[PDB]
Design a protein around this motif. Structure first.
Motif, short mmCIF file in Angstrom:
data_model
loop_
_atom_site.label_atom_id
_atom_site.label_comp_id
_atom_site.label_asym_id
_atom_site.label_seq_id
_atom_site.Cartn_x
_atom_site.Cartn_y
_atom_site.Cartn_z
N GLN A 81 0.68 -1.39 0.15
CA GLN A 81 0.03 0.17 0.02
C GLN A 81 0.85 1.33 -0.01
OE1 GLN A 81 -3.11 0.28 2.72
NE2 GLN A 81 -4.10 -1.79 2.47
N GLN B 84 -1.91 4.47 -1.54
CA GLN B 84 -3.20 4.65 -0.94
C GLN B 84 -3.19 4.27 0.62
OE1 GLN B 84 -6.36 2.32 -3.21
NE2 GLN B 84 -7.92 3.10 -1.55
N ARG C 64 -2.06 5.84 3.14
CA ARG C 64 -2.65 6.99 3.76
C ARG C 64 -4.09 7.40 3.75
NH1 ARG C 64 -3.04 13.23 2.24
NH2 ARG C 64 -4.01 13.81 3.98
N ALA C 65 -4.55 6.88 2.34
CA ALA C 65 -6.00 7.14 2.17
C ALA C 65 -6.75 6.01 3.06
CB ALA C 65 -6.30 6.83 0.62
N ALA C 66 -6.15 4.72 3.21
CA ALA C 66 -6.68 3.65 3.83
C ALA C 66 -6.83 3.96 5.26
CB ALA C 66 -6.18 2.37 3.80
N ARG D 218 -6.97 7.29 6.58
CA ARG D 218 -7.80 8.09 6.55
C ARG D 218 -9.26 7.62 6.54
NH1 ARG D 218 -10.40 12.75 7.98
NH2 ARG D 218 -9.24 14.53 8.08
N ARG D 219 -9.32 6.67 5.93
CA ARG D 219 -10.93 6.04 5.71
C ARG D 219 -11.20 5.37 6.85
NH1 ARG D 219 -9.52 4.10 1.58
NH2 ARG D 219 -10.07 6.10 0.44
N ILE D 220 -10.36 4.44 7.49
CA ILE D 220 -10.68 3.94 8.52
C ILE D 220 -10.69 4.48 9.99
CG2 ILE D 220 -10.17 1.75 10.17
CD1 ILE D 220 -8.95 0.56 7.96
N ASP E 53 -11.80 7.76 9.59
CA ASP E 53 -13.29 8.34 9.77
C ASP E 53 -13.94 7.46 10.19
OD1 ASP E 53 -12.16 10.90 8.75
OD2 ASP E 53 -12.40 10.04 6.68
N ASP E 54 -14.06 6.13 9.77
CA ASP E 54 -15.09 5.17 10.41
C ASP E 54 -14.73 4.72 11.97
OD1 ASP E 54 -16.20 4.86 7.96
OD2 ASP E 54 -14.81 3.07 7.17
#
Lengths: 885, 50, 50, 50
Positions: free
Chosen positions: A746, A751, A753-755, A757-759, A761-762
């Protein structure tokens, strides 16, 4: 006093040529071996790894071994260290409890880095040393005090400090603290003849475990093991036949004495012998240890000639060769021949040619005879190699062949091999004197039995007794046949051939010469049987396997060492005898030495295996693991003496993985005290959580709590606190697993860092683990910097997935003049790093819980008690008044 | 040595491609990395010698 | 044979450029070389005395 | 007797028993003497052992 050294006849006495001892011979032997391979390397072209060749000092390493044997691994202190630490916040009713042992563990060692395997091994084994160092102590002369006629202990030996706690206490509070001090009493304190002080208190769990097994070790080993040890020493002394001290040891023990032992005197020799590429080491210590002080004796001058009147006198057949004296090289060659003589099987000789020397041809002419009369090349072992055996055969053929008197007839045989003919009037066949390794004709071992078995031996690896020329050593105390009757088969055949060859004066010289030869070999038989019995010796399996290995060309692990002598040196060595006028002094302290040797070996094997465990336990931390990493890691922190012993082989630059792992899987072991502590330390170390090697790291959306300031003094009395630490992991659904390789993938895709930020946020937890990370806990009252509070496991240099993070405990401190919304901030401060440790390292305790840790039992002796190390007094001069059963 | 296995060098491969790496992309670098990890060594014998 | 007998003999790889068998037929097959063989024979092998 | 720690006590008990002791079988050198007074304590009260 010894009956074979007294003489009454004018035949076995003469002027002494030289003297010798084991220390000179050992260093000389290593010198010619090393010089031979250096000349080999120099005389041609070689492309290999560079290596320097230096000759070591055996005496220095023996002195250092003796010194290290006196080293004690146990410490005695009256007081145990501080177990737990207290910290006082603004609340005077609730206090922080921390373990000092964990913080010291954090300081001991260095940080974790996935790129460095051997550094990781070194740090782990440093933790191991620290565990054993803090675990090994014995308490003696504890202080005592008298209160209301009753026994009490002092507040500095219980292992906690609370003197600064006294000001923050009210009347009932230090009242109950002093009541607890009065309650801290020493048990069995009413015994008038008391010798033991037993106390209840707190301690570090690994430290207390090592202490408990230490007192178990004190109670277990006692006088009967000393009895067994000295009985084995008696059996060795019987084997060597030394004189005994007329003092006899009586096992009367004083009522105020304590003995300690760290060695078991019976030894497992295979532990010694399993070391890769170490046979030459065993031989060099055997030479340095068992060889007594001896000297070289010339034969009687009257053997060669006898006078009859003033002017007429007989002359010797070898008169031209008798008047000769060796040089330095020839003397060295004589030494090499006698060394090959004194060890059969593992030493090989060779013959040197070079144009720079000039000799008469008769040197080889008689050298064939002396070679066939001076070595054994058959039976159940070997001493020669094939090429020089063939050379000696050719020499003997030429000596029987070149004859100066009137010639006799000869009948040649079919093949072109030498000695294929018949000669003389009696038509004697010389074909029986060809040398074959499977049969062994033409040498001293032919037509006889060369080795024999008897009653059980003190050392279990080799029971054999060597029988040169079919003659034992018991004829010196009590002879068997008359003066003429002493003979053996090959000598008879040799004499009969010489008579058949028409050669008479030489036959007379040899027939006179025979008893000197036989008594020399009787003395060498005694030397081999009695002097050389040691753990360094070759076991029977190797000795019985070597001859098929050499004759079949089979690949062998223990190569015989090949040396080189000169031709005339054989004849010179034929005219000498070895007489050991005294025995080696360090022999009197021989056994215990190797015991220490053996014990230290065991230690290495132990942690060796444990290191291999991590290679199976952790692939990701040890992606780039090569077993030489932990090999060198252990070999750094170790006593230099045993390492020098092993590097005398100089094969440390040649050790492969196969030899090292073949050494790894063997569980052969010899126990010792520090070894026992070692196994128990590694047993505690099987729980990797005991060294702050955690792998539980959790991350999610989290924020610093914001209490409402209602009353300042209420907040003072309560004492709210925070930590990023997880006392317990949350449930599994919110936690997602993550690995090293997926992290790298990754990161390359970007991505990652994107993952995150996604989790993020979750709002669920995220796991970054699988790699050991160091643990740091440091207390910050004020605002920390961002790096500690924001501990990102990925570290940009690409990223590295595992990174250490300091664990935060926040203490809240407030003033009376602060507004109710002084801590109210428009932007909430955030944190994300969470760790799990699975032990109560830091915890808040109410005042009555301050002494809630006293549940462990400690033992101490009175100040009148004395402790004496008794490892040093294991010497064979001690004999039991009541002998072992 | 990595992944519990002894790994050869790009130089001993006999081929030079060291001037095409910086213009590559992420997928090509990952693939060539995996392929480099693919290369192995065999501890063979000849005349009873390693 | 000394150079074949050091204590590091067992794990060493040897190299020889010249085979010992010198098939004699190859020297004899040289046409009309008998006189050359004779003269170089007595050059290389004939000793001198008194 | 010296080993267990009851050597001298056994000898005192046996001498209370008024017995005879043949210390060893090794032969000893004897001497002849004559005096007009009492002998010294060393020759009279002495023990045939150490």
């Amino acid at each position: 006093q010894r009956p074979e050294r007294i003489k009454t006849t004018p035949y076995l006495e003469g002027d002494v040529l030289s003297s010798d001892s084991g220390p000179l011979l050992s260093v000389f032997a290593l010198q010619e071996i090393m010089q031979k391979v250096r000349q080999v390397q120099a005389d041609y072209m070689t492309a290999t790894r560079e290596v320097d060749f230096t000759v070591p000092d055996v005496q220095k390493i023996l002195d250092d071994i003796k010194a290290l044997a006196a080293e004690q691994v146990y410490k005695i202190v009256k007081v145990p260290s501080i177990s737990f630490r207290h910290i006082v916040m603004q609340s005077r009713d609730r206090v922080l409890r921390v373990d000092t042992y964990y913080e010291e563990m954090s300081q001991v060692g260095d940080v974790i880095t996935e790129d460095e395997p051997e550094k990781f091994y070194s740090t782990i084994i440093k933790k191991v040393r620290f565990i054993r160092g803090k675990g090994s102590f014995i308490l003696h002369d504890i202080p005592t005090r008298d209160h209301r006629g009753m026994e009490v202990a002092e507040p500095e030996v219980l292992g906690v400090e609370f003197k600064n706690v006294l000001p923050v206490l009210t009347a009932e509070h230090r009242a109950m603290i002093q009541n607890a001090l009065d309650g801290s009493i020493i048990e069995n304190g009413n015994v008038a003849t008391r010798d033991v002080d037993v106390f209840i208190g707190a301690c570090s769990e690994p430290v207390y475990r090592i202490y408990n097994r230490l007192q178990g070790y004190i109670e277990a080993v006692q006088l009967q093991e000393l009895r067994n040890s000295i009985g084995w020493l008696e059996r060795l002394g019987h084997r060597k036949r030394i004189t005994y001290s007329q003092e006899v040891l009586t096992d009367f023990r004083r009522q105020d004495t304590i003995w300690v032992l760290a060695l078991q005197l019976p030894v497992n020799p295979q532990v010694v012998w399993d070391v890769p590429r170490s046979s030459i080491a065993n031989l060099i210590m055997n030479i340095a240890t068992c060889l007594p002080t001896g000297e070289y004796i010339a034969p009687n001058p009257r053997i060669s000639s006898i006078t009859l009147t003033q002017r007429i006198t007989t002359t010797g057949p070898f008169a031209i060769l008798t008047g000769s004296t060796p040089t330095a090289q020839q003397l060295n060659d004589v030494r090499k021949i006698y060394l090959a003589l004194m060890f059969p099987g593992q030493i090989i000789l060779d013959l040197k040619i070079d144009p720079g020397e000039r000799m008469d041809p008769a040197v080889r002419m008689v050298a064939g005879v002396v070679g066939h009369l001076l070595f054994t090349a058959g039976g159940r072992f070997t001493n020669l190699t094939q090429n020089m055996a063939r050379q000696l055969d050719i020499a003997l053929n030429d000596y029987l062949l070149y004859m100066y008197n009137t010639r006799v007839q000869v009948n040649y045989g079919p093949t072109g091999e030498p000695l294929d003919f018949q000669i003389g009037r009696n038509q004697y066949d010389c074909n029986v004197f060809r040398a074959d390794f499977a049969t062994g004709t033409g040498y001293n071992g032919w037509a006889t039995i060369d080795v024999e078995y008897r009653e059980p031996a003190p050392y279990v690896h080799a029971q054999r007794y060597i029988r040169y020329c079919g003659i034992d050593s018991r004829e010196l105390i009590n002879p068997t046949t008359y003066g003429i009757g002493m003979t053996y088969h090959c000598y008879n055949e040799m004499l009969r051939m010489l008579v058949a060859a028409g050669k008479d004066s030489e036959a007379a010289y040899f027939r006179s010469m025979l008893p000197f030869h036989m008594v020399r070999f009787a003395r060498i038989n005694q030397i081999i049987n009695e002097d050389l019995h040691s753990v360094f010796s070759l076991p029977d399996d190797m000795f019985n396997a070597l001859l098929p290995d050499l004759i079949a060309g089979a690949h062998q692990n223990a190569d015989p060492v090949v040396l080189d002598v000169s031709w005339i040196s054989l004849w010179f060595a034929f005219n000498r005898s070895f007489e050991p006028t005294h025995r080696n002094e360090m022999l009197e302290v021989a056994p215990l030495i190797e015991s220490v040797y053996a014990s230290e070996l065991s230690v290495m094997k132990v942690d060796m295996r444990h290191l291999s465990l991590m290679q199976r336990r952790f692939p990701d931390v040890l992606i780039q693991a090569r077993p030489s990493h932990f090999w060198k890691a252990v070999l750094n922190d170790s006593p230099e003496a045993v390492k020098a012993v092993m590097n005398l082989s100089h094969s440390h630059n040649f050790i492969n993985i196969r030899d090292m792992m073949r050494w790894v899987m063997l569980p052969s072991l010899q126990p010792s005290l520090k070894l026992a502590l070692e196994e128990e330390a590694w047993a505690a170390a099987n729980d990797f959580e005991d060294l702050m090697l955690t792998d539980q790291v959790y991350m999610h959306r989290d924020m610093l709590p914001e209490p409402r300031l209602d009353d300042i003094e209420r907040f003072r009395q309560e004492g709210f606190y925070y930590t990023n630490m997880l006392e317990a992991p949350p449930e599994i659904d919110r936690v997602v697993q993550y690995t090293y390789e997926i992290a790298r993938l990754q990161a390359n895709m970007g991505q990652f860092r994107a993952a995150l930020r996604r989790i993020m946020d979750d709002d669920d937890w995220v796991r970054f683990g699988g790699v050991l990370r160091t643990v740091r806990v440091k207390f910050y009252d004020a605002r920390p910097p961002d790096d500690v509070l924001q501990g990102l496991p990925f570290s940009y240099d690409t990223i590295k997935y595992a990174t250490e993070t300091t664990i935060f405990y926040l203490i809240y401190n407030v003033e009376f003049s602060n507004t109710p919304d002084s801590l109210v901030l428009i932007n909430p401060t955030y944190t994300m790093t969470k760790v799990f440790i699975n032990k109560r390292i830091v915890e808040r305790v109410r005042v009555g819980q301050i002494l809630a840790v006293l549940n462990r039992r400690f033992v101490a002796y009175k100040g009148k008690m004395r402790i004496m190390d008794i490892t040093q007094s294991l010497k064979m001069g001690t004999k039991l008044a009541a002998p072992t059963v």
